[PDB]
Amino acid sequence: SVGGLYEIKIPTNFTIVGQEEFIQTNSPKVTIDCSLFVCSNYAACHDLLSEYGTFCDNINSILDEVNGLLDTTQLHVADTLMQGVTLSSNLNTNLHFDVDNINFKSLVGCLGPHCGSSSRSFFEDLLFDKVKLSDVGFVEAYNNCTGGSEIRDLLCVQSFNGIKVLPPILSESQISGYTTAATVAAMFPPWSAAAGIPFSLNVQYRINGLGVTMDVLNKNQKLIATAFNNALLSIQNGFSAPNSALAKIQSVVNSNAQALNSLLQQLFNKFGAISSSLQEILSRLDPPEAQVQIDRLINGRLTALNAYVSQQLSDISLVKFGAALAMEKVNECVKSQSPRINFCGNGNHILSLVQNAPYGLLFMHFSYKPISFKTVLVSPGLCISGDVGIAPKQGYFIKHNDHWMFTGSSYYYPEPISDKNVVFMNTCSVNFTKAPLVY
Amino acid sequence: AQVQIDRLINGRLTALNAYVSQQLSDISLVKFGAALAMEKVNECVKSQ
Amino acid sequence: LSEYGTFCDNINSILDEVNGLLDTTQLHVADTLMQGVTLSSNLNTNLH
Amino acid sequence: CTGGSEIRDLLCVQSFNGIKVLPPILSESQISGYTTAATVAAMFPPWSAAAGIPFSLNVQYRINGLGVTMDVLNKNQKLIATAFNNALLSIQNGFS
Amino acid sequence: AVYYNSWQNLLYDSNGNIIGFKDFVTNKTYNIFPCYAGRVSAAFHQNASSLALLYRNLKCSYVLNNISLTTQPYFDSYLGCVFNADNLTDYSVSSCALRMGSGFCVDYNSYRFVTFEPFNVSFVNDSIE
Numbered sequence: 059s060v061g062g063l064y065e066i067k068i069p070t071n072f073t074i075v076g077q078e079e080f081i082q083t084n085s086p087k088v089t090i091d092c093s094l095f096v097c098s099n100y101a102a103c104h105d106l107l108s109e110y111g112t113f114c115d116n117i118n119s120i121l122d123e124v125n126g127l128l129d130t131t132q133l134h135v136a137d138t139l140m141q142g143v144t145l146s147s148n149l150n151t152n153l154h155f156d157v158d159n160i161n162f163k164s165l166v167g168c169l170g171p172h173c174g175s176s177s178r179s180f181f182e183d184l185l186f187d188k189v190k191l192s193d194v195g196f197v198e199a200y201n202n203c204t205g206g207s208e209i210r211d212l213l214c215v216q217s218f219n220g221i222k223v224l225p226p227i228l229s230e231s232q233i234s235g236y237t238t239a240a241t242v243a244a245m246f247p248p249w250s251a252a253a254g255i256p257f258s259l260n261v262q263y264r265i266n267g268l269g270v271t272m273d274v275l276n277k278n279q280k281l282i283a284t285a286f287n288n289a290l291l292s293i294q295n296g297f298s299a300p301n302s303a304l305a306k307i308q309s310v311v312n313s314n315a316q317a318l319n320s321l322l323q324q325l326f327n328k329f330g331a332i333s334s335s336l337q338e339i340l341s342r343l344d345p346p347e348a349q350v351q352i353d354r355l356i357n358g359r360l361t362a363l364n365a366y367v368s369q370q371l372s373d374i375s376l377v378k379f380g381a382a383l384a385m386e387k388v389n390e391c392v393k394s395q396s397p398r399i400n401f402c403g404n405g406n407h408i409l410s411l412v413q414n415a416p417y418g419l420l421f422m423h424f425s426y427k428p429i430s431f432k433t434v435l436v437s438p439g440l441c442i443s444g445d446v447g448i449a450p451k452q453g454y455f456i457k458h459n460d461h462w463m464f465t466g467s468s469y470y471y472p473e474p475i476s477d478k479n480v481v482f483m484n485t486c487s488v489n490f491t492k493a494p495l496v497y
Numbered sequence: 498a499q500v501q502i503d504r505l506i507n508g509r510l511t512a513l514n515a516y517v518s519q520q521l522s523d524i525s526l527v528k529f530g531a532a533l534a535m536e537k538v539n540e541c542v543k544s545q
Numbered sequence: 546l547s548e549y550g551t552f553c554d555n556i557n558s559i560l561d562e563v564n565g566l567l568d569t570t571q572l573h574v575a576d577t578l579m580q581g582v583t584l585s586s587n588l589n590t591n592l593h
Numbered sequence: 594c595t596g597g598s599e600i601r602d603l604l605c606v607q608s609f610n611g612i613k614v615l616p617p618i619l620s621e622s623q624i625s626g627y628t629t630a631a632t633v634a635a636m637f638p639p640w641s642a643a644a645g646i647p648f649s650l651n652v653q654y655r656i657n658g659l660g661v662t663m664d665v666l667n668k669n670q671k672l673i674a675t676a677f678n679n680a681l682l683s684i685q686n687g688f689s
Numbered sequence: 690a691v692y693y694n695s696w697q698n699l700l701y702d703s704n705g706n707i708i709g710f711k712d713f714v715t716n717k718t719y720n721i722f723p724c725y726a727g728r729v730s731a732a733f734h735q736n737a738s739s740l741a742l743l744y745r746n747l748k749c750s751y752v753l754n755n756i757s758l759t760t761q762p763y764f765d766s767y768l769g770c771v772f773n774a775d776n777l778t779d780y781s782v783s784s785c786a787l788r789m790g791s792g793f794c795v796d797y798n799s800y801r802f803v804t805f806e807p808f809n810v811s812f813v814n815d816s817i818e
């Protein structure tokens with residue numbers, strides 16, 4: 059400190075920046091037919107497998123529990139998106155897509171059943187087109203297995219060996235309808251997702267809450283709106299680059315496809331038998347010795363299923379943890395602005411929005427970003443009049459024109475000291491700057 | 498020797514699969530602990 | 546052991562995934578500590 | 594493990610049987626550098642970890658927020674600082 | 690096929706399955722594909738006397754021609770061929786015990802195949818402007 063004052067860099071200009079965050083909330087519902095996987099079509103194997111008793115019943119029961127946990131999680135996420143949402147029946151997204159100079163046309167799909175499954179937004183369309191194996195991607199791949207195609211899709215070979223991915227209980231088009239409705243709920247009255255006020259005023263009050271004077275905000279409203287929709291366009295364009303969110307989404311599909319491929323490759327291991335093929339064993343040996351070989355394959359394949367099941371349980375614990383975080387962000391970043399600093403992404407978080415994504419949700423976090431700075435001398439408090447202390451609210455005291463003035467901490471704008479920007483103290487602390495002439 | 502060694506191979510591979518399944522379970526708790534520690538850095542140390 | 550094929554490959558693949566989760570977690574914790582930190586270049590802890 | 598010592602460390606026997614603990618991608622020295630930086634970010638301007646105000650004022654306002662009048666806090670500032678660094682010493686000694 | 694040299698007659702994949710051959714007598718060349726294998730997803734209600742069957746990803750023409758003929762009524766749903774349930778996807782239910790996937794549900798009075806829509810928006814008729 060020089061006298062009572064410290065050197066601080068205060069922003070003199072700013073912009074809004076957008077940051078993407080994919081959170082996984084779901085995973086491919088893998089289902090295994092233990093009998094078809096272990097024994098294929100061979101009666102001599104099904105006989106021996108029946109003497110192992112409940113092992114296939116245990117594998118099926120654990121996978122049915124795991125898939126029920128995924129279904130319950132997907133319902134709880136959809137319930138969280140729809141919670142409290144109230145829309146006007148006059149709302150028509152074919153005409154109603156921008157307000158207060160901010161453009162939402164890309165974030166909003168078809169609203170209401172008259173448009174059918176087209177409720178996916180342009181943003182969600184652009185995100186889904188870069189991921190082949192979404193829910194509809196799996197349904198189309200399995201539909202092609204009886205198409206007679208010369209292409210040998212590993213998904214068909216997996217399904218014919220009893221390894222298959224089922225669709226989720228809610229289609230991604232329904233979830234995209236819920237994220238569309240939750241988005242338009244902030245745009246128009248009654249503003250049920252935006253604290254009951256217009257979206258631009260909510261943005262303005264959130265920026266003011268960072269220590270920016272309202273006087274710059276309500277004159278720069280056009281510059282703030284254009285910064286906001288430029289940030290949204292930068293998020294959309296950012297998926298064409300090697301985007302970390304898109305990389306995370308593809309890693310969900312890739313890790314699933316890798317695990318299923320490893321489980322299929324377990325059928326070709328010999329496990330110390332004369333062959334990995336039941337056709338070869340049963341065409342080389344009679345029952346007394348064929349039993350000894352087939353029993354080695356049954357133990358190998360049942361051990362591989364128990365290993366895969368234990369990995370699947372472990373992974374779905376992480377999917378439940380991720381879904382609980384995504385519901386917390388929908389509640390405390392999108393539908394409201396909880397007073398938690400780095401929870402809703404990094405930096406000076408203004409506001410957040412949500413869109414559907416393959417196996418999860420994609421959040422857009424918008425943050426106040428300083429562009430340029432002024433170094434200034436600031437006082438954290440003043441001692442004034444009859445040694446009454448004052449401290450600045452979300453700001454600093456500064457000398458301007460040899461007079462004490464206040465400024466917000468996030469934007470340099472000298473304004474007069476008043477009870478609107480001050481905390482009073484009946485005694486001033488030590489090392490508060492003496493200013494007997496104030497007030 | 499093959500018949501004996503194959504019992505040792507099955508024993509040792511079974512032990513590795515058990516240790517792997519325990520390690521996956523433990524690391525889920527380590528991730529949960531790290532998520533809490535980041536939340537405390539943000540909401541107790543850098544802010545209140 | 547080679548006639549058990551992918552068993553050792555599966556053990557190595559799961560442990561490499563686990564160790565990659567730990568590494569990614571340690572980076573996210575360090576990022577959380579460093580987030581927003583601004584220091585004066587005049588700062589020297591031998592005197593201050 | 595290759596130092597030729599007569600000591601039979603279990604970590605060496607584990608490593609020779611293919612069981613080994615690798616170092617983390619960031620050393621604990623780097624992490625202790627990051628916790629040091631995050632700590633001094635509250636000591637001095639711009640106070641980037643202490644809400645942009647001096648640490649003692651942040652402590653005083655936090656205590657006032659509990660329902661303690663500002664008058665006793667800014668009068669007893671020396672007693673509060675002494676209680677604070679005594680608490681820190683009590684943690685350090687409590688590790689023994 | 691053009692890849693078979695004079696000493697070669699069998700086409701193998703990376704796993705050692707045979708996937709094609711050249712016939713030693715006729716020199717004709719064929720690809721080999723596996724015969725279809727799959728499950729039936731049967732939906733059952735305790736108050737019912739029958740099952741609603743879903744053949745996932747199969748068209749009803751394929752089920753009837755290549756798997757089995759049945760007397761039950763059938764239709765091609767999005768999920769595959771559905772037997773013994775009425776196609777009522779225009780109808781919707783807010784709760785469902787027999788969840789088939791992709792927002793489809795089996796409901797029982799016969800069985801109905803209907804859409805599952807567990808959540809609604811609250812609507813008001815107030816002006817947006």
Ligand SMILES: *[C@@H]1O[C@H](CO)[C@@H](O[C@@H]2O[C@H](CO)[C@@H](O[C@@H]3O[C@H](CO)[C@@H](O)[C@H](O)[C@@H]3O)[C@H](O)[C@H]2NC(C)=O)[C@H](O)[C@H]1NC(C)=O
Pocket residue numbers: 156157158159160258279
């Ligand atoms: C304050 O109230 C006025 C009047 O209700 C609002 O002005 C309207 O704002 C929209 C932008 O959200 C303007 O749309 C623009 O139209 C041109 C074509 O004319 C197009 O090129 C632009 O891309 C944009 O879509 C609209 O013209 C404008 N209407 C009038 C009569 O000015 C204003 O948005 C409200 N809010 C604020 C913060 O001013």
Ligand SMILES: *[C@@H]1O[C@H](CO)[C@@H](O[C@@H]2O[C@H](CO)[C@@H](O)[C@H](O)[C@H]2NC(C)=O)[C@H](O)[C@H]1NC(C)=O
Pocket residue numbers: 695714715716
């Ligand atoms: C099937 O292909 C074989 C191999 O090309 C044919 O056998 C050869 O035919 C030529 C022409 O008559 C002879 O010069 C060769 O000596 C034959 N043997 C071999 C091993 O090359 C055979 O004729 C073909 N048969 C049919 C019905 O197409």
Ligand SMILES: *[C@@H]1O[C@H](CO)[C@@H](O[C@@H]2O[C@H](CO)[C@@H](O)[C@H](O)[C@H]2NC(C)=O)[C@H](O)[C@H]1NC(C)=O
Pocket residue numbers: 764765766776777778779
């Ligand atoms: C199953 O029932 C649905 C609902 O009645 C049928 O879908 C309608 O089909 C007609 C003729 O193509 C269209 O005009 C409607 O727009 C469709 N409605 C919807 C909600 O998509 C469907 O065609 C029936 N399918 C079968 C195989 O019977």
Ligand SMILES: *[C@@H]1O[C@H](CO)[C@@H](O)[C@H](O)[C@H]1NC(C)=O
Pocket residue numbers: 070071072429
């Ligand atoms: C703030 O920054 C933008 C982008 O550099 C610029 O267009 C604008 O004129 C600047 N305003 C001020 C007051 O410096």
Ligand SMILES: *[C@@H]1O[C@H](CO)[C@@H](O)[C@H](O)[C@H]1NC(C)=O
Pocket residue numbers: 195198199202205207
């Ligand atoms: C399914 O088959 C049709 C016809 O061959 C083709 O147009 C379509 O692209 C295929 N889709 C997939 C996912 O294989």
Ligand SMILES: *[C@@H]1O[C@H](CO)[C@@H](O)[C@H](O)[C@H]1NC(C)=O
Pocket residue numbers: 783807808809
């Ligand atoms: C949802 O809306 C439809 C159409 O108005 C109605 O049939 C159904 O009963 C509603 N369900 C709930 C839970 O509100």
Ligand SMILES: *[C@@H]1O[C@H](CO)[C@@H](O)[C@H](O)[C@H]1NC(C)=O
Pocket residue numbers: 814
């Ligand atoms: C809105 O709904 C209520 C209840 O049906 C009705 O009294 C009112 O006239 C309606 N207003 C419009 C504009 O439809």
